[PDB]
C-alpha cells in the first residue's frame, strides 16, 4: 500500500534480447543500456534530458489515485445496499 515509490519520474529504455549462457545458463545480454534508469523531479526535466541526448521517447501521464468518499457509517445503512453482512 505504500506510495513512496510513485513520487518521481523515471526514464528507462526498451528491453532487448537476453539469452542463456551456454556454460552456466546465466542471462547474457549485449545491451549496454539494459540497467540504465534515471530519476527526474518533473516530466519536463525528463523530456529535456531525452531531447538533448538525442533519444526518441514516449511520455506517459502521471496516474493519481481518484479521491474517494469513505464513510464508516454506510456499513449499517437502513435501506441501502452498502450495508455489510459481516465485520
Amino acid at each position: 500500500s505504500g506510495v513512496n515509490n510513485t513520487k518521481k519520474w523515471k526514464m528507462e529504455f526498451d528491453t532487448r534480447e537476453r539469452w542463456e549462457n551456454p556454460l552456466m545458463g546465466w542471462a547474457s545480454t549485449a545491451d549496454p543500456l539494459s540497467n540504465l534508469v534515471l530519476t527526474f523531479s518533473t516530466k519536463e526535466d525528463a523530456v529535456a534530458f531525452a531531447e538533448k541526448n538525442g533519444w526518441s521517447y514516449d511520455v506517459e501521464e502521471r496516474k493519481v489515485p481518484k479521491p474517494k468518499s469513505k464513510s464508516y457509517g454506510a456499513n449499517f445503512s437502513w435501506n441501502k445496499r452498502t450495508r455489510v453482512s459481516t465485520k
Binding site: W78, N79, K80, R81, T82, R83, S85
Partner: peptide, 8 residues
C-alpha cells in the same frame, strides 16, 4: 419497511 427484501 426499508423498501427492499434485503440489502442484497
Amino acid at each position: 419497511s426499508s423498501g427492499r427484501e434485503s440489502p442484497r
